[PDB]
Amino acid sequence: FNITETYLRFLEEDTEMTMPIAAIEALVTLLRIKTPETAAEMINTIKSSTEELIKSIPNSVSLRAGCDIFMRFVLRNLHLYGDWENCKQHLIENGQLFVSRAKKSRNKIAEIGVDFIADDDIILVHGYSRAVFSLLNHAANKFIRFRCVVTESRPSKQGNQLYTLLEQKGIPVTLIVDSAVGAVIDKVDKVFVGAEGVAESGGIINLVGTYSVGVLAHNARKPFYVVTESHKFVRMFPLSSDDLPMAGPPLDFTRRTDDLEDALRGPTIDYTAQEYITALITDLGVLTPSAVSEELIKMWYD
């Protein structure tokens, strides 16, 4: 029936219905066809389909995290030794209810996390996430004053994409390069960052220059933010500053070339430590440091 093909069908779609929540919805559809009653026939084939999904992954982490939560919920269903049919019906229904929960959480956060942006504050935003931009839009809906500074992120020219999406709202902006980002931290009140993953330790899994932002802000004593939806938690512990799951290059040094083809290669995903984050915002209340780990301990029961 395929799961990778179902995820590939979301091209012109996206937004509101997030990338992990679309992968979880694809997991439920694959589950509900071939009988969820048998725990031997099904769970092994679910594990093989997740393994096939990881093998097809080029540069994504959150899909592996979203599978875990699904699994957990499935196992927790028949924890009460209930009817092997009513528990199954509740499991299949919690697929559309999972995607509906992405709406309710966004409704919660955009009313909680507007409080952090005070009267007339200049913001420097880096790493686009659906939660952080939803804060930015629903604060403009609240009729509050805020200035915005665009960071020139270089994965697939994300800065320009961010700049255009800010233009469609009615908030004054200008381009700032990630090289010169050090020269901005004095006229900026607060620095906001949207995450691709949050660590077991309390650190962050993010894009092509976020650790660099974290350190500079720690030097300038100016606050550093993480805002996300509560599903991007893996049991991952990057021990060092440059160690991450990759399908591509971990810093390659190429031979002598004249035609100029082999060059670009640099760490596209970078880690930052727990100390650099001043504040974290999710739908699971207002909490930052060890909170993430408590969540993970609460899930894994280990």
């Binding site: 009653e37 048998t38 031997a40 769970i43 029961y301 280990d302």
Partner: protein
């Protein structure tokens, strides 16, 4: 070679009681092997093996007590349950496992001496002893007193 099932058919049924030697842990539950019904894998889930923290409990140790829930009689997929077995039945599960272990020990000298497959020797014994008499342990106790 150590193979062939203790009973007549390859795959178990519903409500029948078995004894497992743990070979796996965490995530799902445990893809393992049995000591009551064949040597192939039969999986269980963490919830079943808990009832009642857990990081000191099983961890592929000795033997437990489990009852078969779901059997696939097509390719080979077995589901079990630990909690469901009652305290009075646990003693009966242990005695059947002890009986199965004695039958397996009996049908191993035969394969060693004459250098013939164990599965053929297990098949020729399990027709009057296991099916008609009741069990192979009590039939062996009858044979030693008076053949």
């Amino acid at each position: 070679t150590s193979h062939c099932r203790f009973y007549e058919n390859k795959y178990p049924e519903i409500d029948d009681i078995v004894m497992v030697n743990v070979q796996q842990i965490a995530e799902m539950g445990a893809y393992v092997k049995l000591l009551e019904y064949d040597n192939i894998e039969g999986m269980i889930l963490l919830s079943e093996l808990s009832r009642r923290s857990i990081q000191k409990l099983i961890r592929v140790g000795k033997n437990d007590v489990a009852v078969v829930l779901r059997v696939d009689k097509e390719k080979g997929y077995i589901d079990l349950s630990k909690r469901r077995v009652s305290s009075e039945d646990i003693i009966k599960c242990e005695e059947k496992y002890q009986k199965s272990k004695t039958v397996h020990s009996i049908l191993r000298y035969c394969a060693e001496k004459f250098q013939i497959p164990l599965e053929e020797l297990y098949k020729t014994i399990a027709w009057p002893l296991s099916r008609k008499f009741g069990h192979a342990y009590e039939a062996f106790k009858l044979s030693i007193i008076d053949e």
